[PDB]
MMTF fields as JSON, N, C-alpha, C and O atoms, coordinates in Angstrom:
{
  "mmtfVersion": "1.0.0",
  "mmtfProducer": "UNKNOWN",
  "numBonds": 211,
  "numAtoms": 212,
  "numGroups": 53,
  "numChains": 1,
  "numModels": 1,
  "chainsPerModel": [1],
  "groupsPerChain": [53],
  "chainIdList": ["A"],
  "bondAtomList": [4, 2, 8, 6, 12, 10, 16, 14, 20, 18, 24, 22, 28, 26, 32, 30, 36, 34, 40, 38, 44, 42, 48, 46, 52, 50, 56, 54, 60, 58, 64, 62, 68, 66, 72, 70, 76, 74, 80, 78, 84, 82, 88, 86, 92, 90, 96, 94, 100, 98, 104, 102, 108, 106, 112, 110, 116, 114, 120, 118, 124, 122, 128, 126, 132, 130, 136, 134, 140, 138, 144, 142, 148, 146, 152, 150, 156, 154, 160, 158, 164, 162, 168, 166, 172, 170, 176, 174, 180, 178, 184, 182, 188, 186, 192, 190, 196, 194, 200, 198, 204, 202, 208, 206],
  "bondOrderList": [1, 1, 1, 1, 1, 1, 1, 1, 1, 1, 1, 1, 1, 1, 1, 1, 1, 1, 1, 1, 1, 1, 1, 1, 1, 1, 1, 1, 1, 1, 1, 1, 1, 1, 1, 1, 1, 1, 1, 1, 1, 1, 1, 1, 1, 1, 1, 1, 1, 1, 1, 1],
  "groupList": [{"groupName": "UNK", "atomNameList": ["N", "CA", "C", "O"], "elementList": ["N", "C", "C", "O"], "formalChargeList": [0, 0, 0, 0], "bondAtomList": [1, 0, 2, 1, 3, 2], "bondOrderList": [1, 1, 2], "singleLetterCode": "X", "chemCompType": "L-PEPTIDE LINKING"}],
  "groupTypeList": [0, 0, 0, 0, 0, 0, 0, 0, 0, 0, 0, 0, 0, 0, 0, 0, 0, 0, 0, 0, 0, 0, 0, 0, 0, 0, 0, 0, 0, 0, 0, 0, 0, 0, 0, 0, 0, 0, 0, 0, 0, 0, 0, 0, 0, 0, 0, 0, 0, 0, 0, 0, 0],
  "groupIdList": [1, 2, 3, 4, 5, 6, 7, 8, 9, 10, 11, 12, 13, 14, 15, 16, 17, 18, 19, 20, 21, 22, 23, 24, 25, 26, 27, 28, 29, 30, 31, 32, 33, 34, 35, 36, 37, 38, 39, 40, 41, 42, 43, 44, 45, 46, 47, 48, 49, 50, 51, 52, 53],
  "secStructList": [7, 7, 1, 6, 6, 6, 4, 4, 4, 4, 7, 1, 1, 3, 3, 3, 3, 1, 1, 1, 1, 3, 3, 3, 3, 7, 7, 6, 6, 3, 3, 3, 7, 6, 6, 1, 1, 7, 3, 3, 3, 1, 1, 6, 6, 7, 6, 6, 7, 7, 7, 7, 7],
  "xCoordList": [59.226, 58.224, 58.856, 58.734, 59.533, 60.206, 59.457, 58.879, 59.466, 58.809, 57.418, 56.477, 57.28, 55.986, 55.441, 54.236, 56.325, 55.893, 55.3, 54.588, 55.589, 55.027, 53.75, 53.809, 52.602, 51.309, 51.213, 50.741, 51.661, 51.627, 52.307, 52.001, 53.228, 53.954, 53.113, 53.545, 51.903, 50.947, 50.29, 49.691, 50.41, 49.814, 48.379, 48.019, 47.559, 46.165, 46.129, 45.387, 46.956, 47.039, 48.452, 49.059, 48.972, 50.29, 51.443, 51.549, 52.304, 53.464, 54.705, 54.698, 55.763, 57.0, 58.168, 58.143, 59.188, 60.388, 61.404, 61.931, 61.673, 62.599, 63.868, 63.844, 64.979, 66.261, 66.036, 66.432, 65.388, 65.034, 63.954, 63.831, 63.172, 62.103, 60.889, 61.036, 59.701, 58.447, 57.972, 58.186, 57.329, 56.767, 55.38, 55.268, 54.331, 52.968, 52.492, 52.982, 51.53, 50.929, 49.467, 49.044, 48.707, 47.304, 46.881, 47.544, 45.777, 45.245, 44.739, 44.553, 44.52, 44.024, 42.69, 41.86, 42.485, 41.248, 41.423, 40.478, 42.625, 42.915, 44.141, 44.901, 44.34, 45.526, 46.055, 45.291, 47.375, 48.016, 47.763, 48.086, 47.188, 46.898, 48.203, 49.287, 48.086, 49.249, 50.188, 51.372, 49.661, 50.484, 51.341, 52.129, 51.175, 51.928, 51.606, 52.401, 50.441, 50.042, 48.609, 48.337, 47.692, 46.275, 45.951, 46.653, 44.884, 44.458, 43.09, 42.121, 43.025, 41.792, 41.147, 41.815, 39.85, 39.16, 39.099, 38.904, 39.266, 39.227, 37.806, 37.491, 36.962, 35.617, 34.566, 34.877, 33.302, 32.114, 32.083, 31.529, 32.675, 32.676, 34.079, 34.391, 34.932, 36.303, 36.279, 35.318, 37.334, 37.391, 37.467, 37.981, 36.949, 37.016, 36.135, 36.236, 35.267, 34.373, 32.97, 32.39, 32.421, 31.059, 30.164, 30.376, 29.176, 28.315, 27.293, 26.386, 27.463, 26.583, 25.37, 24.352, 25.488, 24.404, 24.484, 23.64],
  "yCoordList": [30.546, 31.643, 32.959, 33.386, 33.596, 34.858, 36.096, 36.831, 36.326, 37.509, 37.179, 37.046, 37.047, 36.713, 35.384, 35.141, 34.524, 33.233, 33.397, 32.516, 34.521, 34.769, 35.602, 36.824, 34.93, 35.602, 36.522, 37.654, 36.029, 36.804, 38.164, 39.086, 38.289, 39.536, 40.71, 41.861, 40.415, 41.419, 42.166, 43.224, 41.604, 42.203, 41.742, 40.657, 42.566, 42.22, 41.226, 40.244, 41.51, 40.711, 40.229, 39.485, 40.647, 40.197, 40.551, 41.681, 39.569, 39.769, 39.268, 38.178, 40.063, 39.691, 40.24, 41.384, 39.407, 39.77, 40.324, 39.591, 41.619, 42.279, 42.676, 43.537, 42.045, 42.339, 42.312, 43.224, 41.24, 41.051, 42.091, 43.066, 41.904, 42.852, 42.618, 42.28, 42.804, 42.595, 43.783, 44.937, 43.49, 44.521, 44.04, 43.054, 44.735, 44.358, 45.13, 46.221, 44.552, 45.184, 44.711, 43.866, 45.246, 44.882, 44.639, 45.095, 43.921, 43.636, 44.932, 45.939, 44.897, 46.061, 46.434, 45.567, 47.724, 48.168, 48.466, 48.886, 48.252, 48.525, 49.403, 49.449, 50.102, 50.925, 50.617, 50.464, 50.526, 50.242, 51.398, 52.55, 51.08, 52.079, 52.737, 52.315, 53.771, 54.494, 53.645, 53.957, 52.578, 51.697, 50.754, 49.97, 50.841, 50.007, 48.532, 47.688, 48.212, 46.823, 46.548, 45.572, 47.414, 47.259, 47.632, 48.434, 47.049, 47.318, 47.986, 47.438, 49.175, 49.961, 49.945, 50.233, 49.607, 49.567, 50.939, 51.952, 50.96, 52.207, 52.585, 53.767, 51.588, 51.88, 51.124, 50.478, 51.191, 50.552, 49.019, 48.396, 48.416, 46.96, 46.398, 45.854, 46.528, 46.017, 44.502, 43.832, 43.972, 42.544, 41.709, 42.158, 40.492, 39.576, 39.845, 39.148, 40.844, 41.168, 40.668, 41.009, 39.862, 39.371, 40.625, 41.485, 40.719, 41.89, 41.971, 41.146, 42.979, 43.197, 44.054, 44.024, 44.816, 45.68, 45.955, 46.668],
  "zCoordList": [146.717, 146.604, 147.021, 148.17, 146.075, 146.333, 145.843, 146.644, 144.54, 144.004, 143.476, 144.257, 142.163, 141.579, 142.086, 142.022, 142.59, 143.114, 144.502, 144.985, 145.146, 146.46, 146.311, 146.176, 146.336, 146.221, 144.999, 145.102, 143.851, 142.62, 142.747, 141.991, 143.701, 143.905, 144.369, 144.299, 144.846, 145.321, 144.159, 144.348, 142.962, 141.772, 141.626, 142.082, 140.99, 140.759, 139.615, 139.636, 138.613, 137.411, 137.062, 137.832, 135.914, 135.462, 136.393, 136.869, 136.646, 137.496, 136.766, 136.193, 136.789, 136.132, 136.94, 137.396, 137.109, 137.856, 136.867, 136.03, 136.968, 136.06, 136.79, 137.669, 136.422, 137.05, 138.551, 139.277, 138.996, 140.398, 140.684, 139.941, 141.742, 142.06, 141.146, 139.971, 141.709, 140.998, 140.166, 140.537, 139.043, 138.177, 137.729, 137.001, 138.164, 137.793, 136.579, 136.287, 135.876, 134.709, 134.621, 135.41, 133.677, 133.548, 132.109, 131.177, 131.926, 130.591, 129.949, 130.633, 128.638, 127.922, 128.544, 128.815, 128.77, 129.376, 130.85, 131.518, 131.363, 132.765, 132.792, 131.825, 133.897, 134.05, 135.434, 136.386, 135.535, 136.807, 137.779, 137.485, 138.926, 139.933, 140.371, 139.969, 141.196, 141.691, 142.547, 142.67, 143.134, 143.952, 143.102, 143.63, 141.783, 140.868, 140.98, 140.568, 141.537, 141.712, 141.287, 140.587, 141.714, 141.402, 139.975, 139.36, 139.444, 138.083, 138.097, 138.624, 137.511, 137.456, 136.062, 135.069, 135.987, 134.692, 134.036, 134.707, 132.722, 131.97, 131.521, 131.387, 131.293, 130.847, 131.619, 132.62, 131.166, 131.746, 131.723, 132.628, 130.694, 130.61, 130.418, 129.359, 131.445, 131.352, 131.138, 131.517, 130.533, 130.266, 131.536, 132.561, 131.453, 132.571, 133.761, 134.77, 133.672, 134.779, 134.489, 133.459, 135.388, 135.206, 135.286, 136.141, 134.401, 134.374, 135.514, 135.615, 136.365, 137.514, 137.157, 137.849, 136.073, 135.609, 134.104, 133.561]
}
């Protein structure tokens, strides 16, 4: 458990080890937060989110 194998590399979603070191990304409808790890929804009904309202 080094990079992506260690707690998903601290990524919210997609994790990939590129030339060593972690690189996170997000599904369509999300944008990688400034921390390069979190995924922020682009609209009102982002994918994979149970509808609260």
